[PDB]
Design a protein around this ligand. Structure first.
Ligand SMILES: O=C(O)CCC(=O)Nc1cc2ccccc2cn1
Ligand SMILES: [Fe+3]
Length: 222
């Protein structure tokens, strides 16, 4: 399905209605499997961090470590399929120009590639952008083949503001997710008992980032 059709007929209405949007089969099996292979290569090559410290033990060898990350621009060697994923996400957002809320999306971050090792670690409830740092849309791509939450966990639970219910999102293979980055969508990752990969990109609203930049002022010589 073309990016423009997807954007206008589903992503825009759904984001403006619920603030959470799921697109399944975003790139197809070939592309998705190659993305998975590139991410697994990065993991094999040691490109990831050791993971977030969850419990500090006095024998530091017994310290548990959770989500590993690596930042990917999309032009590194052996990452060109990741780059095409991000150019596709960019195409989607570009076709949504001006139609998601009142935001004018003028930029994005690098890709944060996250790897939950499958050792029972999750991610605690949080808000992506709680202090108006300019990020308005969180966009995530899941690449875990035949993931069964019932067996392996790893569900992303979003707690939409003002709604009692949850929104449970399994990290399905070739799945794309959009949600507002601010207080409207607190979320957490339930414990993962298998290796769980995700690729996240945050998109910037021009005005919010422009006035956020001031706090970064601390610059031109005199
Ligand atoms: O993998 C998913 O389904 C998304 C889970 C998630 O929220 N990861 C995450 C990771 C973060 C790492 C640093 C700062 C903010 C962060 C916000 N969110
Ligand atoms: Fe998050």
């Amino acid at each position: 399905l073309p990016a423009l059709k997807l954007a206008l007929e589903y992503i825009v209405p759904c984001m403006n209605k619920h603030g959470i949007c799921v697109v399944d089969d975003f790139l197809g099996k070939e592309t998705g499997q190659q993305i998975g292979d590139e991410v697994r290569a990065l993991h094999d090559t040691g490109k990831f961090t050791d993971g977030q410290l969850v419990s500090q033990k006095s024998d530091s060898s017994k310290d548990i470590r959770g989500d590993k990350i690596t930042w990917i621009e999309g032009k590194e060697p052996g990452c060109e399929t990741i780059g095409l994923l991000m150019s596709s996400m960019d195409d989607l957002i570009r076709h949504c120009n001006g139609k998601l809320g009142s935001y004018k999306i003028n930029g994005r971050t690098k890709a944060m590639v996250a790897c939950y090792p499958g050792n029972g670690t999750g991610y605690v409830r949080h808000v992506d952008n709680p202090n108006g740092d300019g990020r308005c849309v969180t966009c995530i791509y899941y690449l875990n083949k035949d993931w069964d939450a019932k067996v392996s966990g790893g569900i992303l639970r979003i707690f939409p503001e003002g709604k009692a219910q949850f929104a449970d999102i399994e990290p399905k293979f070739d799945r794309l997710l959009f949600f507002w980055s601010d207080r409207r969508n607190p979320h957490e990752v339930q414990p993962a008992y298998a290796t769980r990969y995700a690729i996240t990109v945050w998109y910037f609203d021009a005005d919010e980032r422009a006035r956020a930049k001031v706090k970064y002022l601390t610059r031109v010589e005199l």
